[PDB]
Every structure is written in C-alpha cells, then in structure tokens.
Design a protein around this ligand. Structure first.
Ligand SMILES: *[C@@H]1O[C@H](CO)[C@@H](O[C@@H]2O[C@H](CO)[C@@H](O)[C@H](O)[C@H]2NC(C)=O)[C@H](O)[C@H]1NC(C)=O
Ligand SMILES: *[C@@H]1O[C@H](CO)[C@@H](O[C@@H]2O[C@H](CO)[C@@H](O)[C@H](O)[C@H]2NC(C)=O)[C@H](O)[C@H]1NC(C)=O
Ligand SMILES: *[C@@H]1O[C@H](CO)[C@@H](O[C@@H]2O[C@H](CO)[C@@H](O)[C@H](O)[C@H]2NC(C)=O)[C@H](O)[C@H]1NC(C)=O
Ligand SMILES: *[C@@H]1O[C@H](CO)[C@@H](O[C@@H]2O[C@H](CO)[C@@H](O)[C@H](O)[C@H]2NC(C)=O)[C@H](O)[C@H]1NC(C)=O
Ligand SMILES: *[C@@H]1O[C@H](CO)[C@@H](O[C@@H]2O[C@H](CO)[C@@H](O)[C@H](O)[C@H]2NC(C)=O)[C@H](O)[C@H]1NC(C)=O
Ligand SMILES: *[C@@H]1O[C@H](CO)[C@@H](O[C@@H]2O[C@H](CO)[C@@H](O)[C@H](O)[C@H]2NC(C)=O)[C@H](O)[C@H]1NC(C)=O
Ligand code: NAG
Ligand code: NAG
Ligand code: NAG
Ligand code: NAG
Lengths: 404, 68, 184, 49
C-alpha cells in the first residue's frame, strides 16, 4: 500500500595506469656489451613492447567504450527546476576548479627508480564532461537521444514512463509527486552521508592500486635480488671480475631478471583481461541500465530499476542505481474468477481484491481498488470448470445510459 | 614523452614535447593518440585538442515534446 | 625465429657442436639450447592460452547476442546496435562472424504542446497508453514514438480521481462514443 | 612427475648429494634441480590461475 525509495551503489574499475619500460635499461642498465649480448638472444624485448602497446590500446578502447558512447555533447540548462527535484548533488560545480559534482569531488578525495609511466589519453576532466553530458541527455531528453536524435520530454512524463515500464500507473505519481521528490532527496542525502562515512566503499580501486604497487615493489626487490650470484651490481662485477670470466654470472643474472619480468608481464596481461571483462560488463551496464529502461531482473541493482546516474571516478566508474522497493503490505482475499450470470469473469490487467465484503480490482504491485466493471474485465468459459471461483455481480456502465 | 625538449615549432605538453608540430587553437578529431588530451594529425603537422563531439544543448521544456 | 638463436651457445647448429666439442660439455650446451627453446615454447603456449580464452569469451558474447536479437527480438536497448533493433541477418566469415543488425531511427521531430491529463467534468482523464499533444487550438492523443493524432475519448483514457491534485492540467471536452447512438 | 624428475641432475634426493658429493658443485646441482622444480611450478600455477 506504500512506496519506499530505494537506491544502491556499485563500483566497477575501468582501467589502470599503463607502463612501458625499455628492456635494455631494465635488465642490463647502461652496459653496451650486455645489449650486444642480448641482441642475438632473441626478439623478446620486441614482444614485450608489442604486448604493452596492445594493453595500452585495449585499455584506451575500454575507456572510450565505457565513457564515450554519445556523438553529441549536452549542457545542463541554466534553470535547475524540473518540477521540484534536486540536481545539485549530481550537477558539476562551476565554483570547483575540477568542474565536478560534490559527490564526484568526495569520491575523488576518498580515492588516493628505473620505471616509467604513461598518463591516460583522456583525463578526469573529459570523463566528467562526458558524464555530465550523458546525465543532461537522460534528464532533459530521456532515452530519446539514446536511440536517435535528442527529443525534449517533460521530467514528470519521464517518471511516468519509467513507472509504467515496471507496471505502475501515473495517478499515484501525480497524487504524491512532492512526496516522491522529498523521498528521493532524503535518500540521496542519506547515501551521500553513507559514502562520506565509508572509507572502504571504493575498496575495489584501492585494492587494484595496492596490487599494482605491490607488484612493482616486488619486481624492484627481484631486481635487487642477487639470484645466487656474487653480487647484484653488474658494474662492480665488471670492475672486479675478469672480463673473459663472469659471462655465465651475467647471463644467469639477466635470465633471472627475464623470468621475473616475464612473470610480471603475464600477470599484468591476465589482470588486463580481467579488467577487460569488467569493462565489458560496465559497457553493457551503460548501454542497458543507463541509456534506457531495462526490464531485466536483478541486473541494474536491487529491486525494480527506475533510473541510474553514473558519474566519473578515478580509474573506474560509480553507479547511482535509483530503484523502487514496495512496502507496507496487507492481507487480502483472492479469487481466480468471478461467477456472474453463470459466466466466469477474469481481470484484464489486475487481480481481484477484497476485504471480506466487497470485491474490487487492483494491480499486482500497488493497492488501488477499483469497481469491477465490464470494460476492465473479459468473460470466457463457465464457472464449474474453474476452481476457487466465487459469486459477485458486475457493474455495467452502459445500462444507466438508457435506463432513463 | 615525460621530459621537456629544452634540455634535449616545439609544443610542450604534460605527456611530453613534440617537435615539428604547429599548435592550432581550433579543435579537430585525431586518429593517432598521443596522451593527456593532445592530438596531432598530418597537414606541416597540426597539433590540437581532441574534439569531444558536436555541441547540442536543447532548452528543457515541461510543456513541449519533440514527437517525430 | 626463436629456433634461429644461439641461446648463449657458440652456434645455432647442434651437429657441428656435437662433432667439435667434447660430449661432456656438448651435452650441457644441448641441454641449455633445448631448455631455452622450452621457455620459448612455454611463452608461446601461454600466449595461445590467453588468446584462446579471449576468443572463447568473445564467442560466448556473440552466442548471447545471437540468442537475443537474431533468433527473435531483444527488448534491451543498444545491446546489439544503436537505436531500436528490429531484425538482423548475420553472415558467415572465415574464423569469425559478422552481425548485420537493422535498426529503427526516428526522424522529422516537431514541437507539440502537452498536458499531463485532461480535466473534464471535474475529473482527470489520464491516458492509458498515449500522451496528449496540442497543435495550438485543439488537443490530440499520440504515442511515444510516432505522431498519430486522435480525438480524446473514454475508451482510450482512464479516470482515477478528480483533476485538482495534479499540476499543469488543462480543460478540454471529452467525446463519449456511446452518446450519438441513442442521441437520435 | 615433475618432483620425481631428475631435471638433469645426478639424484632427485638432496640427501644423497649432500652425503656423497663434495661441497663444491653440490650447491650447483642443488640449484639446478630446485630451479627446474621452480619453473615447473610457476608453469603449473599459471595454468591453474
Ligand atoms: C508512506 O510512508 C511514508 C513514511 O512514513 C509516509 O510519509 C509520511 O507522511 C506523513 C503525512 O503524510 C508525514 O507527516 C511524515 O513526515 C512522512 N514521513 C516521511 C519519512 O516522509 C507516507 O505518507 C506514506 N504513504 C501514504 C500513502 O500514506
Ligand atoms: C538541493 O539540495 C542542496 C543540498 O542540500 C540544497 O543546498 C542547500 O541549501 C540550503 C538553503 O536552501 C543551505 O542552507 C545548505 O547549506 C545547502 N546545502 C549544500 C550542501 O549546499 C539546495 O537548496 C537544494 N535545492 C536546489 C534547488 O538546489
Ligand atoms: C471494504 O472496502 C469497501 C471499500 O471502501 C468498503 O465499502 C465502503 O466502506 C465505507 C466505510 O468503510 C462506507 O462509508 C461506504 O459506504 C462503503 N461503500 C460500499 C459501496 O459499500 C467496505 O465497508 C469494506 N468492508 C470492510 C468489512 O471493511
Ligand atoms: C455461485 O452461484 C451459482 C449460481 O449462481 C451456484 O450454483 C448453484 O449451486 C446450487 C448448489 O450447489 C445448485 O442447487 C444450483 O442449481 C446452482 N445454480 C446454477 C445456476 O447452476 C454456486 O453454488 C455458487 N457458488 C458457491 C460457492 O456457493
Ligand atoms: C489543429 O488541428 C485541427 C485538426 O486538423 C485543425 O482543425 C482543422 O483545421 C483545418 C485547416 O487547418 C480546417 O480546414 C478544419 O475546418 C479544422 N477543423 C475544424 C473542426 O474546424 C486546427 O486548425 C489546427 N490548428 C492549428 C493552429 O494548426
Ligand atoms: C478549468 O475549469 C475549472 C472549473 O471551472 C476552473 O476552476 C475554477 O477556477 C476559478 C478561478 O480561480 C475559480 O473561481 C472557480 O471556483 C473554479 N471552479 C471550480 C469548479 O473549482 C479552472 O480554473 C479551469 N482551468 C483552466 C486552465 O482554465
Ligand atoms: C496475514 O495473516 C497471517 C495470519 O495471521 C499472518 O501470519 C500474515 O503475516 C498476514 N499478512 C499480512 C500481510 O498482514
Ligand atoms: C619545461 O622546461 C622547464 C625549464 O625551462 C622545466 O622547469 C620544466 O620542468 C619542463 N617541463 C616539464 C613537464 O618537465
Ligand atoms: C521547439 O521549440 C524550441 C524553442 O523555440 C526550439 O529550441 C526547438 O528546436 C523546437 N523543436 C522543434 C522540433 O521544432
Ligand atoms: C514549467 O516550468 C516553469 C519554470 O520552471 C513554470 O513557471 C511553469 O509553471 C511550468 N509548467 C507547468 C505546466 O507547470
């Protein structure tokens, strides 16, 4: 008999910081003779370079598939009034230098040598602009811009269509529009406070960053490891050991470093495959839950999905999956059919509901009793074949027209 | 990438410095990524910022629907 | 190309090494060469495993796509093509497949004055499945995808309560189709 | 099979090598057999991951 506002958050990493280290300085440092020795050993360094370039381009493809899904850039209207709803928590703040939402700024603040790193092609500013454009598209134009050109639609019409997608009429939305807006604002504030009070909410990105840091530290330690040699420094060996000698020592050092770096490359590309699967799932979530209304069960969060409000995140993306969860149930009498004039009557779109005295019709998700008439019911078969049928009359609206 | 060309028409970006490209204030679409939102394309060589897309921001109306 | 590398040996040919070097160290050189080729093969087969896993994942994704929007019609939006998908005719490919997806795109949009419902006879006439539009002086009901004007009647509109709680309603007459039969 | 393999060493048990061979080159044989066991086990854990 009552509606409860529901919203759940989801965390999905997208990409990590790509790295590219030259093999010669990584293994042999500045030794020219070591480079000459590894020249004829094989084309392993070319394979590593090709692999890292492939990882970089597939991470870029994953990022542009997750974020850059629209060919048009949308800007929010200056009038921040859509019938009474609040959009300050999701709209970017012009006063902030990062041009991000307060929730986006909060999640950015929460998320915190012989090696080189490459910055991403698209920084957080363009991702934030893409998210703001798609939020403007899904607010002002709804899902019309998803399947073609952007078409203006009223926001109450958007909630009415979203409620009718799951089987809720617009009369209860019209009756409690202010209540719906107040409940949505209260839920948004509550989840904002919960995200501000939860340091482990974004634990997936922190886990990925910590795993990368542990991997690079372990590889640095393996570089510092002697691997069962006289010393871990090639220059001291060259300045002390015989130049005809120590060839086997430096060969075992470089092949141990090669084994360590190939283990690192294999685990990095397997983690890249894992994050590619995660980015594919995120892309499906963008294509189905975000651009339009998805009727899929338990795909866009807990409960009946209404709309989702994705936002930019460092090395990932967040999910503001606003859903609907019913509450305040009550016992009611059930009958599969109504026996009127020897014929069985069935509800066209609802279920027969009674409190013990009078039989009515209501939807399966909300308690909206209505007078059982001829237009909202269809008649087929008889009463003896069906089981559980009860006796009641059916009002005919056509009769009083010609009764007078 | 990663350094400045002063300590080696040069344009210096956050990712690095590119030699042989002329910076253009107009923003176009690039085919070869470089990094940090900087894009370069042939025709000497023009350097610019990657275009996000076409700009279209229709005014929201609560009484008008663009029915096809 | 991995077979044409010395791998730390004096030469890439093994028969000459066996003929020249003493077998006590020739066997060590042969062991080093074959174990280096063994790491080459293990890297190649690990790359093959990664490629096979990626190909299997892509094949599973394609199987889900063809189960959704090839055998029938998928109600999901933008799952297998931009716009509203209607039908698809996929074609064969060597060691692959191509999905020829046909979609529906609207065109020729037009502005229309709209109202949430119609306040007539002290009651609100909400639309059952359409949306009310106006061309400036007359009101019509249309769908959410195509402009199909129609006179607002009692069959296509349902009434649930009065027309004062709602915001932004307008006043317009509702034609009852049952009246003209007994009007005469 | 990998732990039972000699991996080109003299014996698969370190006790016989320690009690028979001199301390020179015994650590070489031990290192060779254990690193064969290593490369086998990193390959193994790669297929299991
Ligand atoms: C559904 O439950 C909510 C929560 O109790 C009701 O909202 C309350 O409404 C009363 C008066 O209508 C207010 O005094 C309270 O402040 C409201 N509380 C909250 C948390 O909003 C709502 O009225 C219920 N729905 C119906 C149809 O009765
Ligand atoms: C939307 O919600 C925000 C957040 O609560 C509202 O901003 C508050 O406004 C009051 C005055 O109306 C101030 O006292 C608070 O300090 C503001 N809070 C924050 C976090 O800025 C805002 O008024 C609401 N309405 C609109 C239209 O934005
Ligand atoms: C079951 O619900 C119906 C619908 O509200 C009730 O019928 C009305 O009840 C009110 C007060 O309860 C009366 O003022 C109306 O005159 C009743 N209308 C009709 C057509 O009977 C009915 O009383 C309820 N029954 C029980 C046992 O609670
Ligand atoms: C619902 O009403 C029908 C008739 O409107 C009832 O059918 C009658 O049942 C009695 C005894 O079971 C017979 O003597 C009559 O001849 C039946 N009438 C007809 C027209 O067949 C039916 O029993 C009622 N249901 C319940 C649960 O009482
Ligand atoms: C809105 O549409 C209605 C329905 O077509 C228009 O009413 C007719 O308009 C045509 C010419 O536009 C006249 O020839 C008919 O006589 C009109 N019908 C009646 C019953 O008078 C109406 O003119 C349109 N209004 C606008 C502003 O375009
Ligand atoms: C639609 O018609 C109703 C009914 O006449 C209008 O409601 C009247 O509004 C005036 C203006 O304040 C009041 O003096 C009357 O008492 C109202 N009548 C009733 C029965 O409540 C309403 O204003 C009309 N709306 C439009 C947009 O024309
Ligand atoms: C219906 O009545 C039963 C019997 O007391 C009770 O166990 C159940 O909780 C009731 N359900 C509702 C929704 O009131
Ligand atoms: C550019 O060169 C200046 C020296 O004039 C130096 O201070 C600065 O750090 C360089 N920029 C970068 C990104 O290194
Ligand atoms: C509707 O009117 C607005 C405001 O005049 C305009 O911006 C928009 O392009 C119009 N749309 C159509 C389809 O005519
Ligand atoms: C549409 O919005 C404007 C300003 O936000 C408001 O003045 C107007 O009354 C709204 N339209 C309706 C029908 O309420």
């Amino acid at each position: 008999t009552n509606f409860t506002i529901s919203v759940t958050t989801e965390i999905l990493p997208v990409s990590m910081t790509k790295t590219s280290v030259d093999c010669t300085m990584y293994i042999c440092g500045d030794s020219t003779e070591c480079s000459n020795l590894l020249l004829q050993y094989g084309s392993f360094c070319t394979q590593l370079k090709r692999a890292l370039t492939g990882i970089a381009v597939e991470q870029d493809k994953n990022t542009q598939e997750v974020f850059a899904q629209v060919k048009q850039i949308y800007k929010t209207p200056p009038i921040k009034y859509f019938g009474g709803f609040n959009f300050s928590q999701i709209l970017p703040d012009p006063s902030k230098p990062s041009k991000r939402s307060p929730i986006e700024d909060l999640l950015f603040n929460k998320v915190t040598k012989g090696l080189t790193v490459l910055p991403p092609l698209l920084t957080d500013e363009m991702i934030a602009q893409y998210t703001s454009a798609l939020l403007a598209g899904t607010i002002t134009s709804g899902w019309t811009f998803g399947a073609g050109p952007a078409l203006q639609i009223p926001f109450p019409m958007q909630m009415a269509y979203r409620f009718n997608g799951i089987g809720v009429t617009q009369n209860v939305l019209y009756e409690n529009q202010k209540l719906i807006a107040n409940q949505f604002n209260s839920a948004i504030g509550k989840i904002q406070d919960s995200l501000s009070s939860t340091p482990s909410a974004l634990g997936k990105l922190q886990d990925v960053v910590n795993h990368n840091a542990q991997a690079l530290n372990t590889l640095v330690k393996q570089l510092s490891s002697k691997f069962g040699a006289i010393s871990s420094v090639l220059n001291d060996i060259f300045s002390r050991l015989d130049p005809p000698e120590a060839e086997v020592q430096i060969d075992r050092l470089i092949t141990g470093r090669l084994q360590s770096l190939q283990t690192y490359v294999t685990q990095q590309l397997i983690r890249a495959a894992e994050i590619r699967a995660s980015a594919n799932l995120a892309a499906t979530k963008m294509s189905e839950c975000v651009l339009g209304q998805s009727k899929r069960v338990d795909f866009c969060g807990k409960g009946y999905h209404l709309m989702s409000f994705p936002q930019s995140a460092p090395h990932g993306v967040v999910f503001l999956h606003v859903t609907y969860v019913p509450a305040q149930e009550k016992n009611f009498t059930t009958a599969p059919a109504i026996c009127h004039d020897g014929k069985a009557h069935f509800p066209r779109e609802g279920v027969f509901v009674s409190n013990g005295t009078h039989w009515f019709v209501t939807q399966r998700n909300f308690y909206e009793p209505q007078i059982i008439t001829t237009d909202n019911t269809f008649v087929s078969g008889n009463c003896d074949v069906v089981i559980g049928i009860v006796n009641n009359t059916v009002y005919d609206p056509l009769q009083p027209e010609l009764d007078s | 990438q990663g350094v400045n060309c002063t300590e080696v028409n040069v344009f210096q970006t956050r990712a690095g410095c590119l030699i042989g490209a002329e910076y253009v204030n107009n923003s176009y679409e690039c085919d070869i990524p470089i990094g940090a939102g900087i894009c370069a394309s042939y025709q000497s060589i023009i350097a610019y910022t990657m275009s996000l897309g076409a700009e279209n921001s229709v005014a929201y109306s609560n009484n008008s629907i663009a029915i096809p």
